[PDB]
Amino acid sequence: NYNAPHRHAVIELSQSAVVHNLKVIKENTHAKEIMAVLKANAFSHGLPEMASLSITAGATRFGMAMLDEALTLRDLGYIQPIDVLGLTDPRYARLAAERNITLAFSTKESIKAAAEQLAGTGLTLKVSLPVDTGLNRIGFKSREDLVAAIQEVSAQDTLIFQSMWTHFATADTPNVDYVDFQISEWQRLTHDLPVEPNEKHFANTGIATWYPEKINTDIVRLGIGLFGINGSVPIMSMPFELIPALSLKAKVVNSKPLKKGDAVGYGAEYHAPNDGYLITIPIGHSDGYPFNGSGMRALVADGQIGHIVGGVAMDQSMIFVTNPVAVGTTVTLIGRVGDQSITMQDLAEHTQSSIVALMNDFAPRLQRIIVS
Template sequence: MYRASEHRPTQAVVSLENIKHNIKLYQNKKASHQQIYAVVKANAYGHGAIPVAKVALEAGVDGLCVATVDEAIQLRKAGLTNTPILVMGLTLPYGIAEILYYDLTITVSDLSFFEQAFYQLKKNQQENLLKDNQLKFHLKLDTGMSRVGVRTKEEVLAFVEGVKDYSWLDWQGVFTHFATAGGGPLSYIDYQWERWQDLIPYIPDFVSLRHFDNSAMGLHPAIGDHSDIIRLGISMYGLSSRDSVPDNLVTDRQIAAYHLDKDSLRSTNPNSELNLKPAFQLLSELSYVKKVEKGTRISYGASYESPEDEWIGTIPIGYADGWLRAYANIPVLVEGYPCPVLGVINMDQLMIRLPKEFAVGTEVTLIGQDGNYNNHPSLLAHMAGTISYEMLSCISERVPRVYI
């Protein structure tokens, strides 16, 4: 095992080579006019924003996407100064000076942001920032996600007219987000596509970037090529946006052992055809091993009682690390054996049933391959009633990341 700490063995191991591999798959499939922006929000879906952003740029992506201004500033301070960074979430106008100083591209959904931002600069006597800097932004269109964005022709026309009052703007792009590309009825894509086509003619010609592709839409056979940017998120990390599990990674034996419905793990999602390679492993070690007698109570609330004498292992990981209580039905892997969690998961530790005695220090795989079993994130997400995005992004910063 790679050791990130001398004090606690729990760690996430991230394969930067697999991230490069997954980017290459999209580079080989994209249209010649399309750019790829690596989505590194939420600490790069738990993989580590700065290392992932750096390796993505080395692999040839054209820009980066984050959710917040603070995430973008973190990347700039790490030395990523010569690449576009699009902040996809809405931001408050009070931080306009930092947005300009760090040369960030923000998302807006109404004209009031510009009025309030200019007032903030005047209030702080920072109007001089506008002499050498323009505010770069993309307009968000709401075509059916119903989260943020301009929704109607009238709203678009009002926005187009209103931005003329601000000479310090650099309107670079317009975009939307398809709500069901990664899950839900695929027919809804057609509805959103029609909405997009209804609104986009009213965007001025000088707005050069028009985009809607995420990982799934980037491979849509009829629509994907019409987006100027592919915002490459979950597939960059080696996973399907619909959490389909590749046949070659999880065997029928494992599906039976985990009591899963085989058909529920398959998907018609277009990126299931790609040879994506997961980049994330979550590893730990047995910190304590003991044999207990029949009737022994285990974990908080005495939530488990041993039906017979059995070997019990303790692992130093819990819900404060992002291994949530809802994951109590997910076996972990010890030397190729799937071992069930016993009782409730604690804040910092959990207990498992071992098939036999193992030494303290034996490696434990929570996410990743061990022998004939693969705790693939998408498979585990099915078991926990969630999605792989959530599982990975919830792994807390207390868990060190090791990069290989």
């Protein structure tokens, strides 16, 4: 009840793209398992669609940010392993236990708590223990703390020691040796434990792309690369091609000539610099399109190159074109028309805005469609 199927504005998600992206990243790292990280409604691309595409692409498990996102997948019909990579109130451990959802914990006392929640229910909880190696967001910060926590899960019959893992801060980036640092930090914080977990995993998109040999990549936690976006800072060249999954289109709802000097948009600050035609489409910055995307190209279906002008409004954008355009004509905001294309990267460049932030702004109000 968020999407608007009767509004001719859509996000297109290419199946063939996602398939290629996982293949090429998996190839680069000779991974055995690909974990599709579809947190935040699949990086705002649309979870039901991306989850499906991910499995089609060959992912075999999921990573989500929180329990409720994990619940949603189960409710979607998926039976594959699901890791919650954020932290969870132990009071709600029972839900994860009942739906085979693996939960991360960063504290011995929270582990204890989650186990006591399950005491006597006949339920069992898979547990993961993130180790903080330098990101400093979550995880154990000392071998001693880690070893104690492992001790606790071994003494709790309702818990399974599913995994240990850590996350990189600069695998995205020319900063090797913060990568190497986190890796020696792992060795420090993690060397011979009193017992092993079922699995360990380390790699995000960055690791898999630019540092495949630094560390074990049998299990890859693949988020952004899936969506065909190069998020590196600065933009680093890759050992392969990503093809972006999402394109953004809508059909003209209002069409009119406007005369030189006519003001457009809130503030009345854009004035047409000559006679032409103004084209109104039904997506705005409430759909996720950059609040300051005005001045962006926009590829009309007839092969014209228009430009967003006036404000980008909440629900509507206005486009200036030289030649008449009929209502119903689709306009591509992101994607390809002929030999012209507009990318998320063009968008980032134009708005002086992070591509990671832009790829993540799309609201559920836009109707999603899977293609090729």
